[model samples]
Target: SAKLIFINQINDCKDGQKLRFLGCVQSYKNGILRLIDGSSSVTCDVTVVLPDVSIQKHEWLNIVGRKRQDGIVDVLLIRSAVGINLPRYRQMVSERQKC
Candidate 1:
């Protein structure tokens, strides 16, 4: 399963201005990061570093969901593309009883 980390929250600058932020993960591999705006997703590569603790990637981190309610942007860290699937314990027990 992928590791998701919530970064921070920021308010929109203008009335409908798109908001975003740059972040880094020490355990990132393949030099690529994925950002989900809502239903859509985009991949970006590292670009440069700023005076602030934040980082500057080659592309903007486009969120996958609709715009924030209070105009507050929420940043997140998506670690992996893998997902997890566990068997239902009830079904497993029934199958075991048959055996």
Candidate 2:
């Protein structure tokens, strides 16, 4: 399972490290985006080397990206975050039951 880290703890990540998080598309222009997850926000100067991408504003995003040294991130995969976050108790029960 992927280690889910909230936005507030983003800086705790390492450079070139892979991570996943949920946030809204606050802003985007020329491959740069201002991503916000309520309690935290960041400006991701994206990776132009990868293919261009687009996302709806204010929609929840499941971002898989690498942490950068200068507070920036190179996003690798982006998807809708709908129905992804389940409560901890539910997760534990599901695992225990193996359902």
Candidate 3:
């Protein structure tokens, strides 16, 4: 099962664990994708799972991935999350982490 967590929590997670998260695109180039929520930032591997992923700056993305030992995510699914209210989503993530 994929664990839903904020970007800030990624460092605490073990490698090879499946994770689900939401963040806006901060940078993407050469198969390395960078993202940031209000909480923190993370780097992801786009080429491992998807050979062709089109993304633009500030686009909201929902990511499903396995955490690699090197501290980058091996993305399994990457998709745009348009129309999401990020502020509320961040709040929801924090609330979910409480339980």
Best by TM-score: 3
Model 3 score (lDDT): 0.85
How do the residues 27-48 of candidate 2 rate in per-residue lDDT, one tens digit apiece? 7777787788666886676665
User: Candidate 3, residues 1-99: lDDT per residue as tens digits?
Assistant: 799998878878999989999888988888889998875888988866345566899898999999896458888899789899878887898898888
Best by lDDT: 3
- Residue clash pairs of candidate 1: 36-64, 37-63, 37-64, 37-65, 38-64, 38-65
Give the Cα lDDT of each candidate: 0.32, 0.68, 0.85
In the order shown, the candidates' Cα RMSDs to the true structure are: 13.8, 5.2, 2.2
TM-score of 3: 0.84
Model 3 regions more than 4 Å off: 48-53
TM-score order, best first, reads: 3, 2, 1
Worst 10 residues of 2 by lDDT: 88-97
Please give, for residues 16-80, the per-residue lDDT of candidate 1 as tens digits: 33433332322223554444333333343433222433333423232322223443333333222
